[PDB]
Amino acid sequence: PIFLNVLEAIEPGVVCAGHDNNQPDSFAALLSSLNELGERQLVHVVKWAKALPGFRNLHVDDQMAVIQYSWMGLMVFAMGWRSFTNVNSRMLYFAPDLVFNEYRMHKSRMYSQCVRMRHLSQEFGWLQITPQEFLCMKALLLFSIIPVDGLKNQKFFDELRMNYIKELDRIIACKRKNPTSCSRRFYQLTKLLDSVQPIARELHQFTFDLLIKSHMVSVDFPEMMAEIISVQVPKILSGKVKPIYFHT
Numbered sequence: 001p002i003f004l005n006v007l008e009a010i011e012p013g014v015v016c017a018g019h020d021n022n023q024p025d026s027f028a029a030l031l032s033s034l035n036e037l038g039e040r041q042l043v044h045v046v047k048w049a050k051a052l053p054g055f056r057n058l059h060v061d062d063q064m065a066v067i068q069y070s071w072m073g074l075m076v077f078a079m080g081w082r083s084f085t086n087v088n089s090r091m092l093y094f095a096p097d098l099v100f101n102e103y104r105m106h107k108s109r110m111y112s113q114c115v116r117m118r119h120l121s122q123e124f125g126w127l128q129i130t131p132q133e134f135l136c137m138k139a140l141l142l143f144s145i146i147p148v149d150g151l152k153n154q155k156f157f158d159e160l161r162m163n164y165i166k167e168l169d170r171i172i173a174c175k176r177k178n179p180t181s182c183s184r185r186f187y188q189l190t191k192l193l194d195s196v197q198p199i200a201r202e203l204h205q206f207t208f209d210l211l212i213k214s215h216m217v218s219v220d221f222p223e224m225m226a227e228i229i230s231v232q233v234p235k236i237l238s239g240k241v242k243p244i245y246f247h248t
């Protein structure tokens with residue numbers, strides 16, 4: 001129906017990192033390219049978000065707020081999916097020009113986090129996630145993290161988030177023959193969605209600490225990334241902004 005046509009239409013295409021693969025895989029270069037890629041994906045996330053049904057109706061400050069708090073989860077999720085469809089989750093497919101193998105995972109100094117990310121990617125397979133479910137789940141990640149003291153207009157946010165969860169229901173209910181399977185599916189997908197948060201939090205910690213010592217380890221942070229990671233990420237790391245979990 002209408003909802004799905006929109007999600008499929010506004011889905012971003014391929015985004016390159018600009019990484020020079022003809023150079024050695026050093027920590028400095030890898031992370032600098034990961035950051036450039038982050039900067040680049042940020043642009044598409046803003047456009048994608050503002051193309052989502054009802055998003056433009058949220059207060060403007062809240063629009064920027066939710067994007068600034070949820071981009072990590074959004075990009076990690078999309079990446080995991082790309083990884084599943086492109087290389088069957090055998091490697092982290094950040095970008096066509098930035099695929100991480102075992103060696104790069106280690107060189108990046110975030111090996112265990114990459115492992116968590118590959119596990120997430122694999123879930124798409126174990127759970128046989130359909131493209132429709134991926135799209136609706138991803139739209140939901142945009143509405144999955146807010147400040148403890150609420151947004152400028154929490155009411156509208158809670159209403160919009162509810163409607164997106166409803167859409168996810170339709171998508172689940174539009175296939176499952178029996179009723180015990182839908183309840184089960186919803187449980188599986190909400191668990192999957194929650195599982196994204198812990199991974200995002202770890203990357204939040206990592207990039208934050210990395211920005212602090214960026215000058216000493218020669219890692220470049222583009223403008224947007226540097227401001228968001230020094231202004232927004234810290235609100236998450238200090239507990240002022242928290243994720244919305246379905247389960248305990």
Ligand SMILES: C[C@]12CCC(=O)C[C@@H]1CC[C@@H]1[C@@H]2CC[C@]2(C)[C@@H](O)CC[C@@H]12
Pocket residue numbers: 031034035037038041072075076079093094095203206207210
């Ligand atoms: C979101 C990105 C870039 C977009 C993507 O495909 C997922 C990936 C997950 C790791 C992030 C990276 C952006 C730059 C970060 C934040 C580095 O500073 C450390 C963790 C990196």
Ligand SMILES: O=C(O)Cc1cc(I)c(Oc2ccc(O)c(I)c2)c(I)c1
Pocket residue numbers: 001002003053054055057159160163164167
């Ligand atoms: O499935 C469908 O019919 C499509 C659909 C999808 C959504 I998300 C939805 O939610 C709102 C709520 C407030 C608002 O201002 C806007 I714009 C949209 C509605 I209403 C309909």
Ligand SMILES: O=C(O)Cc1cc(I)c(Oc2ccc(O)c(I)c2)c(I)c1
Pocket residue numbers: 042043046047050063064065067068224228
């Ligand atoms: O695409 C559009 O609508 C135009 C547009 C694009 C961008 I990028 C933008 O600025 C930022 C920069 C970083 C960031 O995290 C956020 I949130 C917003 C603005 I304001 C408007």
